[PDB]
């Protein structure tokens, strides 16, 4: 009976493979051949931020496009003013091992988490002129890998227990739990509408979830190893992923299939971070070789290189206005490029 | 061309920097270690000298100061500990059935790409249990390991007074297999320090201080260009 059900499962997978083959009329390469090339893109370091005394694991940009937050294993979180390179605040953390940080859209709160298995919220604006912890959220049985804020009272988190959750900050409890991965979850991205999100895991698969009904609409496959990074295209109808097999791939939600792969023979190291420009023409990635490569999304050709670090590049970000890019490293420094 | 309020903000930033520098100086006075074990090891009782995601212990010997971490809450989280002074690995010598599983785990840690420059201290626990099984003669290491029968204890090897020849051949045999993996891979970068221990033994903390003194000395010879 168990074996009989296993045969039924394979039959359904066979039907799924046939349907996506029928929709493969053409390739992205044959449609975009006539388009003229982007050119050569050269960028320079415009600012260097110094203060952390240990490797940096995460960073996030404010909606204003002038203020940013960074997290390091020295047990400290810092808020910076990019234009004047001044430090607005420094926050002491109870546990040294932190793997994630987030900035609220309102600008009134920040969040951090790690091997402690807890996500903590901090109130930036209060009388008494100090920053204090507001709530601590507990319930996950594995390390916290990523966290993002839907609103002042809503946050989504990912974990190494193979599960994701949505929380109510005032109550301190989880409204919904999303389950179905067989491997640790490493990354999360939220759509512009805020009605859907995508996740990537060590099982080499990515899933799309609906926030209101707690269900998995579609599953995507193709990579040969763990996926460490995920991002959403500006329209909201496509997404990009990066893995330790040294390749990056682009997927389309409506077609339900991979459109293109970005790879070169010289590159043999893994990819740690991914981001897109405001138009979506350029894709930016970070590598363990200490260098960041720029790619033309439409034609899959490398256009530039931005290398300024003596250790592994761990994080990347682009401003909402589109003016600048920020990078972080295990060398203890952050740089701004334009 | 500069505002009064802008000058005051810059003064606040300089004061924040002074506090961060002072906190960093406090860290260079302390040494950090990671504990790894398989649950039949008895790893928790190793340091009798002093005392969900992560657990910690603190102890001090001869004015130097030490902190130990156990993540009992491994491929992805081991990247964080690439700057620790040393890693402590514990095994139960008496269990013949689980010995091969322990050997495979050690090989993965020794050959990991983020732990290339980190040295390992190996503790072989339950040495009292091994002695009674060897003397009793009901259980034979030869059944689990075929090459043991064609083994002779090293000619220059010396054992503690009173220990039977049989125990000396068996103890030396189990120590040799782990040292073999260490010699085979990384060279000129890392050494394994092997010790045999029992639950009652109270000298474990002194042994760790001695091994760290060797680790710092070897790095200084490299920094000064002598070697």
């Amino acid at each position, epitope marked *: 009976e168990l074996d009989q059900l296993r045969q039924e499962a394979e039959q359904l997978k066979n039907q799924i493979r046939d349907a996506r083959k029928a929709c493969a009329d053409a390739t992205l390469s044959q449609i975009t051949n006539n388009i003229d090339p982007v050119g050569r893109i050269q960028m320079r370091t415009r600012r260097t931020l110094r203060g952390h005394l240990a490797k940096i694991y995460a960073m996030h940009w404010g909606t204003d496009s*002038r*203020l940013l937050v960074s997290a390091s294993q020295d047990g400290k979180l810092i808020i910076w*003013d990019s234009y004047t390179t*001044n430090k*607005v*605040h420094a926050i002491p953390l109870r546990s040294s091992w932190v793997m994630t940080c987030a900035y609220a859209p309102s600008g009134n709160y920040v969040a951090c988490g790690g091997l402690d298995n807890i996500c903590s919220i901090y109130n930036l604006k209060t*009388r*008494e*002129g*100090n920053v204090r912890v507001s709530r601590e959220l507990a319930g996950h049985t594995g390390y916290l890998s990523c966290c993002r804020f839907l609103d002042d009272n809503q946050i989504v988190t990912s974990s190494g227990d193979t599960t994701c959750a949505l929380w109510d900050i005032e109550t301190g409890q989880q409204t919904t739990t999303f389950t179905g991965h067989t491997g640790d979850v490493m990354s999360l991205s939220l759509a512009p509408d805020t009605r859907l999100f995508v996740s990537g895991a060590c099982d080499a698969s990515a899933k799309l979830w609906d926030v209101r009904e707690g269900m998995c609409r579609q599953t995507f496959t193709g990579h040969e190893s763990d996926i460490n990074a995920i991002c959403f295209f500006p329209n909201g109808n496509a997404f990009a992923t990066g893995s330790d097999d040294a390749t990056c791939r682009l997927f389309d939600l409506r077609a339900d299939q991979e459109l293109m792969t970005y790879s070169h023979d010289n590159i043999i190291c893994g990819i740690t971070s991914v981001s897109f420009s405001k138009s979506g023409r350029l894709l930016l990635a970070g590598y363990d070789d200490f260098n960041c490569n720029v790619w033309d999304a439409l034609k899959a050709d490398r256009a530039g290189v931005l290398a300024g670090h003596d250790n592994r590049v761990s994080c990347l970000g682009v401003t909402d206005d589109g003016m600048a890019v920020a990078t972080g490293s295990w060398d203890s420094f952050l740089k701004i490029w334009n | *061309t500069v*505002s*009064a*309020e*802008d000058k*005051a*903000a810059a*003064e*606040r930033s300089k*004061m924040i920097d002074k506090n961060l520098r002072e906190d960093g100086e406090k860290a260079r006075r302390t040494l950090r270690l990671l504990l790894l074990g398989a649950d039949n090891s008895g790893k928790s009782t190793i340091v009798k000298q002093m005392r969900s995601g992560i657990f910690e212990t603190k102890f001090q010997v001869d004015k130097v100061n030490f902190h130990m971490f156990d993540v009992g809450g491994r491929r992805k989280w081991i990247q964080c500990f690439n700057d620790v002074t040393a890693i402590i690995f514990v095994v139960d010598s008496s269990d013949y059935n689980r010995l091969q599983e322990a050997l495979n785990d050690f090989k993965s840690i020794w050959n990991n790409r983020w732990l290339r420059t980190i040295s390992v201290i190996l503790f072989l626990n339950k040495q009292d249990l091994l002695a009674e099984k060897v003397l009793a003669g009901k259980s034979k290491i030869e059944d689990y390991f075929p090459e043991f029968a064609r083994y002779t204890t090293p000619e220059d090897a010396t054992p503690e007074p009173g220990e039977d020849p049989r125990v000396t051949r068996a103890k030396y045999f189990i120590r040799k297999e782990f040292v073999d993996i260490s010699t085979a891979s990384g060279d000129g970068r890392h050494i394994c320090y092997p010790h045999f221990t029992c639950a009652v033994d109270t000298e474990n903390a002194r042994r760790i201080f001695n091994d760290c003194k060797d680790i710092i000395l070897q790095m200084n010879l490299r920094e000064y260009n002598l070697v």
Partner: single-chain antibody
Amino acid sequence: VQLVESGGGLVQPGGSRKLSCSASGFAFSSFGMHWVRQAPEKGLEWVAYISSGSGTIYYADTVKGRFTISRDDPKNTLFLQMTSLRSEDTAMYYCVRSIYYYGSSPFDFWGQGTTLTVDIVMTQATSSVPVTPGESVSISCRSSKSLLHSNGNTYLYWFLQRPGQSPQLLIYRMSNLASGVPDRFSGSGSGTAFTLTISRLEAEDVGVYYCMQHLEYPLTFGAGTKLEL
């Protein structure tokens, strides 16, 4: 948050006295502190400033050479030593707290005050405007030099003193509104000309309104305008 001040009384001319302020409910060390005085029937005038960390100290020309400012961070106290007193020194003195960082609101809290008995020019021409409940009013301030800076910020502040009490911040940096303040109040202007508009006037809006500049030291204030029913 509370600031309480003591040390005041009749003094003969040529004498000396020390005034003290005690702070509670907030982090005293992280905030810069100032002093201001109001003459018997006149308006607000600034006296001195001490920075957090005690790095920067500034003084008005009239009191320079005869007054000193100090702070004790462990005991949460601030002091003013005054020497060679003259008749012009009679007034009421107040303690004010200020913090400076991107997006901060300076001059937020003021103490009750103690009584002792012994440059950019800002002009608000109207001295009195009669008002009725339920109507909209506008108040205007003019400046000798433009308050707009190349950074893109214009530095002008508005305050209200209702009868029998200390001054309260209403607007900072021309357009921003302070916390705990009703949305009826609004501020607009250009370098050298500024306006504050109050809609749906109600009782409790009666008092004297003042304009101040923070572009450069010394800090200066306008004479004030009174709204009366």
